[PDB]
Design a binder for this molecule. Sequence first.
Ligand SMILES: *[C@@H]1O[C@H](CO)[C@@H](O)[C@H](O)[C@H]1NC(C)=O
Ligand SMILES: [Cl-]
Ligand SMILES: [Cl-]
Ligand SMILES: [Cl-]
Ligand SMILES: [Cl-]
Lengths: 347, 351
Amino acid sequence: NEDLRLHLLLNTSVTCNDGSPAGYYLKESRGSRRWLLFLEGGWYCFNRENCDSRYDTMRRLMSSRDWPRTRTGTGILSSQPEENPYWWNANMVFIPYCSSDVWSGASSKSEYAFMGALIIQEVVRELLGRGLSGAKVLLLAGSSAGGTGVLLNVDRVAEQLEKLGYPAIQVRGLADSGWFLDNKQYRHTDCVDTITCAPTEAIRRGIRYWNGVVPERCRRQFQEGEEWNCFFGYKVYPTLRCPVFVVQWLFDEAQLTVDNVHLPVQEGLRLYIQNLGRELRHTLKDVPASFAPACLSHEIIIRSHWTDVQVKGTSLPRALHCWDRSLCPVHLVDSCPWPHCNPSCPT
Amino acid sequence: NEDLRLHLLLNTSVTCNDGSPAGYYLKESRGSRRWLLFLEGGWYCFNRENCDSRYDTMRRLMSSRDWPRTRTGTGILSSQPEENPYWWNANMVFIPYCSSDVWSGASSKSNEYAFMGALIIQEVVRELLGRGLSGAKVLLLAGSSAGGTGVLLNVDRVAEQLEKLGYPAIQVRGLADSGWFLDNKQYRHTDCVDTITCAPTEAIRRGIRYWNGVVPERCRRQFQEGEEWNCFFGYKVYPTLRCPVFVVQWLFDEAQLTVDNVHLTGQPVQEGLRLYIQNLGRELRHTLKDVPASFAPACLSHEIIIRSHWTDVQVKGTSLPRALHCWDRSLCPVHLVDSCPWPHCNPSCPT
Ligand SMILES: *[C@@H]1O[C@H](CO)[C@@H](O)[C@H](O)[C@H]1NC(C)=O
Ligand SMILES: [Cl-]
Ligand SMILES: [Cl-]
Ligand SMILES: [Cl-]
Ligand SMILES: [Cl-]
């Protein structure tokens, strides 16, 4: 059977938001030495009222209470050769996002618990006893908040492994839709909701609220109290030790959301969406391992139709395989200034 | 905290519809000698076509693949004194419904769906024996909807299973909630296509054959071979039951009304309909006349015993928790049937 099976963490102090046990889903591939560890996304909450609102409407993302005992791997987590041509035979790990902290929270005592960073550490620990100790490659992957979770945790995982005495494991990151800009909103608004709040201000508040840690290498590049900078890809990325492949829609829906763009087209708005994509292209200029198509979308790597997207006649699975080889083209950014200008874009 | 923990059946050849392992949730109460085994409901499917659409639309009821590792006991399964004042401390078991066969499938053999409801119950009971059940005084087999009818189909089989296994000191009892149906004429006829609106006699006739379903022997020996469908209907199977069985049944069950093709959208209500609903209450009350242990409010609703608000409904000043406690004593009124046959004549009906 191909289903990933749920394991809830044995260590008791590491929990979801509501105190219920955190966990991970696993499908072993007992001949393979490739490990794919996926971090789920789905926003965050940065004060009590917002978190209480998320609890009433999106409880899945704050609790393990109703997690199914198995899960079907999809996209990059699929065991179907046709859905996942290069990596279908890998050991597959799915880590549910139940900490609402962009996987940054690192204090083990608690109201709502915020333990994103410790959940990862603890998943890694358990996996060692389940084959991870024999790995050639551990690819920490993630979508949206999980994608930003990758940039926040990839070096911490590399260093956890080497401190645990497994330095041969090669640790890499794949960040999908977690590469945002701390930019000016289109039309300004106050920080009320999760949805509307300015990228900068959301993280500023969040980090204080979660006791969030940022990677040590990025942290020391900024003054104490300015740790928020490290939640933004173009700032944390240059500091990274592990190789990280960046997948980002040039017009990410979540980027637009926090930028306050709601969707008839205003002419002032056309010039902003144009500019945003150009700035993103700019930030990705020196990012050798990247796949940035000019579409209006959000997330891709565990979507089934992740195979159908192409940039410069190359698919995403191919780009990733070229990247794995490099350690066929690898730097795939669209020079194409408008949404839907790629014919590959999802429907 | 007080959550029931999942155990999948060790014998993996006893399965849900799709081949996945069946199982049960358990909360151990080691100081208690009472056991409550709950059978979940949620319809059935009686041919390949609607079993396929049920698989597309309601996969949870044909598979164990999406079950959580733990479950909170509610109502009669709750460990909260206030939610469940007499039984909070019992040993608690929830048996999810993944067989779509009203718990009647006894056939291991079966590319087809597998129907193993009666075998699932059998396996749950035998596993439980090694987890404390062997030292029990009371095993109450409870169920809601299809699980309610499943209680009627299975309670004596469980009693026979335990005596044969050398545990005669376990008193087996039944609690059937919303599993007491009439094999009646529909209000407006439909062709038997959709599960939920296929006339009840016809649905069961097809089901039994499709599931290779079994009915209790004592009821079976009372009808012609091939007419075993009769034994899915409470008033027909109840008289030959050996085990004592408490019957909880809304006078106007939404599932009964649905298989009768009655739809209470609102607006005015026609005279033909009014007449039909009146007769339904009457026939239902009549079938309960010689059931000493019953609780039948005049409400339009579905299921109750694992609902959090199961403590609120009253019949003649008596609550369901109390009614059950009284029944426990008997083995303090126990025969509680509303006499006004209109939905909501009773003021304590659920909203
Ligand atoms: C399941 O396995 C047990 C022990 O191996 C056996 O005794 C039991 O009868 C089996 N049940 C069925 C229905 O095959
Ligand atoms: Cl295991
Ligand atoms: Cl999809
Ligand atoms: Cl190649
Ligand atoms: Cl155990």
